Amino acid sequence: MKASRLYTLVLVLQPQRVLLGMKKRGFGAGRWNGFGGKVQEGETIEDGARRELQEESGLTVDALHKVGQIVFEFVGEPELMDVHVFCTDSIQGTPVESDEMRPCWFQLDQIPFKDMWPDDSYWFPLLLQKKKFHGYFKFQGQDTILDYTLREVDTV
Ligand SMILES: Nc1nc2c([nH]c(=O)n2[C@H]2C[C@H](O)[C@@H](COP(=O)(O)OP(=O)(O)OP(=O)(O)O)O2)c(=O)[nH]1
Ligand code: NA
Ligand code: NA
Ligand code: NA
């Protein structure tokens, strides 16, 4: 089994809208996404999620809610991406464009799935229903899923 590297993903989800960012470069460029990145040495996963939210969007939050975990495998890449997914409904400040991301709010009847990673179609609806989930997706490149598993869980 491949080694895995820790990543975070943070969704600011309010009652009628969600904050996404347009990835300007790097992994997932050109796709809307939550904010996040590699967990660093010495921080908890939740603290790494808070840090990435602040670095990529300018927003601070004191606390996050863990809602899911998704493991990504890419054909031809040796490491799995172990993505820990967090939400919050309570933000301090305004989103700001970073080098990584251009922020944009979307209404919850206008989730831009066509410009999001294909796997988000499966797990994002669970997040919106306040369910907790574990997922795994194997990709060939950026567009093709070869295998996946998704389960609703009571405890992440
Ligand atoms: N919604 C969604 N998010 C994903 C998928 N795959 C995936 O890695 N992510 C998230 C996890 C991270 O938030 C982000 C990947 O991390 P990143 O490459 O931006 O990490 P980073 O900010 O440390 O990278 P960098 O500045 O060094 O380039 O994308 C996916 O299929 N769907
Ligand atoms: Na980052
Ligand atoms: Na990032
Ligand atoms: Na899509």
Q: Please, are residues 52 and 35 in contact by the beta-carbon 8 Å criterion?
A: yes
Query: Which ligand neighbours the alpha carbon of 142 most closely?
Result: 1
Question: Cα separations (Å) of 105 from 43, 47, 51, 80?
Answer: 29, 24, 20, 30
Q: Which residues line ligand 1 (CB under 6 A)?
A: 7, 9, 26-28, 33, 36-38, 72, 81, 83, 100, 117, 119-120
Distance from C-alpha of 10 to C-alpha of 46, rounded to nearest angstrom: 10
DSSP secondary structure code for residue 45 in this structure? H
User: Of 85, 106, 96, whose CA–CA distance to 59 is shortest?
Assistant: 96
- Using the mean position of ligand 1's atoms as its centre, give its distance from the Cα of residue 28 in Å: 7
Name the domain count of the chain.
1
Resolution in A: 1.5
Q: Is the dihedral of CA 130, 109, 102, 123 positive or negative?
A: positive
Pocket test for ligand 1, best of 5, 7, 101, 115 (most atoms within 8 A of CB): 7
Distance from C-alpha of 49 to C-alpha of 55, rounded to nearest angstrom: 10
